[PDB]
Amino acid sequence: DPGFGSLQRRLLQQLYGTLPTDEKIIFTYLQDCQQEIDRIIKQSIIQKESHSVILVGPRQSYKTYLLDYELSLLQQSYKEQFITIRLNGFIHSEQTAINGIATQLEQQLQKIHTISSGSLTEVFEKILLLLDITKITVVFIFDEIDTFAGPVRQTLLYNLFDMVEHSRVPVCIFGCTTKLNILEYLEKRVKSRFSQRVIYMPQIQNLDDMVDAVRNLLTVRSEISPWVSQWNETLEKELSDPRSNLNRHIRMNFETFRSLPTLKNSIIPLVATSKNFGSLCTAIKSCSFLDIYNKNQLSNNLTGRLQSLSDLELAILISAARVALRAKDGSFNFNLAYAEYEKMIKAINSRTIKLWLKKDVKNVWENLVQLDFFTEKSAVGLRDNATAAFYASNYQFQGTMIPFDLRSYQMQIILQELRRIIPKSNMYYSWTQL
Amino acid sequence: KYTPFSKRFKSIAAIPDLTSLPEFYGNRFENKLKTTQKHQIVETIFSKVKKQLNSSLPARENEFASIYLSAYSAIESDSATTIYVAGTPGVGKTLTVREVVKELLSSSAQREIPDFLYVEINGLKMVKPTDCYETLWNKVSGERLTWAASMESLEFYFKRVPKNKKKTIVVLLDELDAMVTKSQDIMYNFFNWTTYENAKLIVIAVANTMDLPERQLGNKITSRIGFTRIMFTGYTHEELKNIIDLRLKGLNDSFFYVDTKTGNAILIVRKVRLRMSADAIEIASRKVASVSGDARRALKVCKRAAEIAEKHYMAKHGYGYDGVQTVHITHVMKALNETLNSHVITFMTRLSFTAKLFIYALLNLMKKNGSQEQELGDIVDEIKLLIEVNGSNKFVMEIAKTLFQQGSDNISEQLDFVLNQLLDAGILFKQTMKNDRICCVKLNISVEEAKRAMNED
Amino acid sequence: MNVTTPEVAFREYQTNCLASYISADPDITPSNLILQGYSGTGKTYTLKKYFNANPNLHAVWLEPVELVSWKPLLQAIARTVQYKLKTLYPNIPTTDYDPLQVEEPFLLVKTLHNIFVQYESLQEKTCLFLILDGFDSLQDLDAALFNKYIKLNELLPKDSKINIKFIYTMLETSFLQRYSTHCIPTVMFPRYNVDEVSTILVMSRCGELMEDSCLRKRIIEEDDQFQNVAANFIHLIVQAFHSYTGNDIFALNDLIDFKWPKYVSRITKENIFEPLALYKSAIKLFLSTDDNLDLSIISKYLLIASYICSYLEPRYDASIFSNPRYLQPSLFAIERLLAIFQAIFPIMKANIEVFQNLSELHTLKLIATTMNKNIDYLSPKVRWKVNVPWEIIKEISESVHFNISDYFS
């Protein structure tokens, strides 16, 4: 159907955010936040005024989305008065940040109407000789600025802030970080050159703020499909009634997640899976597909992995949990887990379960380790940065030299939690009380 | 190149005069940042105030006369000395030295003192700590050598070269704490040259602490700097008053020609007079001096207060960017309240129930054991313990079906979103551990401000 | 969304989720897509059949497990992207770049920007899917490695005709929960049960078992009939090894090939129509897993004395010669080992023959020490400890007629 194909594509483009600048969706609770950001952008490109503001907000709090909308609004009228210089804190390191500024400057100057030539010392020398009828606003977009605010030295943070007060070239720095206390991460001299302009991103307070945001993301305000007038009546009917299924999923996510991009991960596959207009109105009223998405997200955790185990995989995890529970530090190995499993088979058959030999439990023991159930005692695991990951690979741990039957392991789930996720129909329920 | 200055000539007497060479002592990126304007920048009555308050000497009398007298007795007398400048970051340390060099440059043109060369070397504006030798050799000699060739060239030049074919060099050692290395070879070489007879080098070191050579440097480098040190005292409350009044001397208590059509103001159509209350300047300079006495902080407070007043003035009229405007004390007090406030308290009050339950469960475990180190397995057991308190009541079981089953019969009873959210916000901490039960959880923020957010819900 | 959804066995929800994200239009396609799922869940099977039925999508496959370190990973991305774009549009003259020049995360953005600038002659926007089958399977893995790939599309120009698409296939669960605050549409893959595992192995092994060389040579020495025979052996293997293997596909596929020639030779002219007599004739192939497929006298006694010094306190040694085995062994000294070894030895001084057998005992990794690489035997601070289990040390003492169980009773 050509009518449903135009409505399905328009509804999906609104949730992802690929709409043009002339048809962007602005929420109600975010309207008072983009006005302050627009004031700084309009004052540095038009009025040519140096500014410095570092945004502070949680993850997926519409930080980069608001900055991308301000750059697209100014490009539709003032596209020859400023440039776009983007920076990252995770990709660009300390030495790579110097070459990243000179690289983004030679490609933006040739587009309006070298710098990144030589060694690392000659590159930084040409940058200070350039930044430090009208001028050109050098808009700096810094992402994850908390990584560059190291307590050892902040070289880039000291030179970037110097291009605002002393320098005459209008440089607009828009830092984006997640730390709430970004003022303490700076040095004594770095914080002196900053204007102390920390704009905190607002969050969802009441329940009506999330309803207006979802309604504005699924309402087609353009005449591009004959099913537009029929879809707006169905969406407004389910949202205005608090006893519907759409209002229940919003209230549940408001007290558990309270995030707009998180809830948008389930509305996108709900519309794309609809074959026609009749299937779209049915899934939006009963919300049958939303319950399937919630079960899949909690299917590979500690609860969903227990249902995919056999009778031997459950008996080993139960017998190994009783050893660490009765111990002082919870240390156990393969020899301690085999003693509890062997005493359980002879006790049940005395009141026929095939007793496996010690040569067969080795395959079951290694299968539970890969399934995230038995963690090594006093083990770091995944390192933070790449520095500690290289030093840990060259050092041979003590657990690799000792055999597998003498390796100290730890239980990822205590016996108190196993009794709640096991029904009464199983025969291994009597050995989970101790 | 790699050839030092010692192998450039044959002998010592064979070196010609360096002052008559069109290459010693200094003998293209400003055109690409220009564009044509196709509009008109509408400047309101508050635009001229913000531009004059920017960082681009009535409160410094004894400090300006001490640095000028130390250099006047060495340049004319053809000697070498070392001036130490220490103070709070933002008291006019670099600006005082810049005014001394600018005053000495005007006296050199009057045929009074010999000509000198001003070299500005910043420690924080360099990538490598050994890059300061290449910058000094390029400004004095004019060549481009490496860090190893420039170090040996400066020693041979500041010793064997006589004074009849030399020239005074004034080097400003900006950010002295940035050039501090482990071997302490760069800091010692920059101070040992001033103790030579045939040197004629003026070194003006600028740091941030008076006890810097007594803590980082040793007894050898401290004996070469000098016992006399100039301490830059921070600005008080009576010195910051004339600083703001000097930048807005011709703008305060003056009439403007603000247009009612666009909003353009012309400094001498309505006759709008701009006046700033004197009480707002006294209440702002006193708070700045009571914190650190930063010179840039006193200018940023009046600039932020004028920006807030300009936002309400443009919104109430509907101007754009393209009777008497009086800045009261409300704009100044609001400019200082946005910084001294703590957004950590209001951040936890707007979180969801799952995020608020994790904070309430962590604080309850601290009042039972008192160890400031609760594991991840104890928080999960404490959360489930609070749910089963009144399980028989219908009012409490309504939330158990969502936190453990999400309102679905097919979803089993659960045992990550709110955990990683508080970690990136700088509130909660978590050690590097592969286990999810014995992993200790510590609080980064205070404990007094965390309990106030739980009681507000 | 115009795409074809294939039919996958027991993957109706997983196939519908891939069609809702992967599309030919970048405006309705997310920049990140994680396919979390453990081994034996069918992550690669549901992705190959989805891209084979639709030939309009251009996907790039990459295996990070074959690059060990993270440095060759950045070089393999720019090398596979340029090679894929070369054969896609051969009528466009592009410039070949060196993939070995990508040594930093910043250099990857400059290399990808120098390629997309010469591909602006197209009409519509063509997606570029970069499937990373096994992202968490990389060796030198850290918590900051995934943060550099989820923000790659931000540095890329928005006005580009070719947009990259990252697809990750994780394996564990804790690795996915570390980035749950980024709001990434993750498609989980639950493990199959006892009803879906046997059905998958039947529709995947019947086409190679009935046409094997062993089964065709047995019917001539002693197509619907051979199908039920091969299907009965697969069902009998899963039901007999459901507890030893669990729900893994690789663990059950190896046991089938290991018992297929042994099950064909046990079939005669009477066991072809009677499945009851065939199961009784080959009872040794289902009751067990069939597994998988000279020490010196001084060397045997040295391991006995080393087991005592590593599992007993040295303060009570003056009362015997004159469960601690369930924990890690303790470290002892060289002179402390020769004292017990000389007492338990039958009717000998410490000559070079005793030290020769002790040095060879450490080469076979039978006794551990305090240093692994570059060990100093003459150092007085380096201690020695045992490194053999109790079952290994039990059979050694039984060959020399030595009572080793009475010392710990």
Ligand SMILES: Nc1ncnc2c1ncn2[C@@H]1O[C@H](COP(=O)(O)OP(=O)(O)OP(=O)(O)O)[C@@H](O)[C@H]1O
């Ligand atoms: N250019 C864009 N076009 C469309 N949507 C966008 C764009 N930039 C961001 N978004 C949307 O913004 C939402 C919220 O993430 P956003 O990038 O705004 O937050 P962030 O805090 O800057 O990011 P992160 O926490 O991952 O560092 C995402 O779900 C994404 O869909």
Ligand SMILES: Nc1ncnc2c1ncn2[C@@H]1O[C@H](COP(=O)(O)OP(=O)(O)OP(=O)(O)O)[C@@H](O)[C@H]1O
């Ligand atoms: N008397 C003054 N009147 C007005 N402004 C002043 C005065 N003295 C100093 N300043 C301001 O002080 C600012 C900082 O000066 P300077 O470069 O010397 O800093 P500093 O004391 O070395 O410390 P930092 O730069 O690390 O904050 C200058 O931009 C200048 O505008």
Ligand SMILES: Nc1ncnc2c1ncn2[C@@H]1O[C@H](COP(=O)(O)OP(=O)(O)OP(=O)(O)O)[C@@H](O)[C@H]1O
């Ligand atoms: N639903 C299914 N129907 C039929 N065959 C299947 C199904 N799921 C998986 N398979 C088969 O399982 C075999 C082995 O699984 P495969 O290695 O592809 O899975 P995976 O989950 O992608 O693996 P890994 O975790 O190692 O990346 C494949 O060759 C495929 O044919």
Ligand SMILES: [Mg+2]
């Ligand atoms: Mg972002």
Ligand SMILES: [Mg+2]
């Ligand atoms: Mg300074």
Ligand SMILES: [Mg+2]
């Ligand atoms: Mg695979």
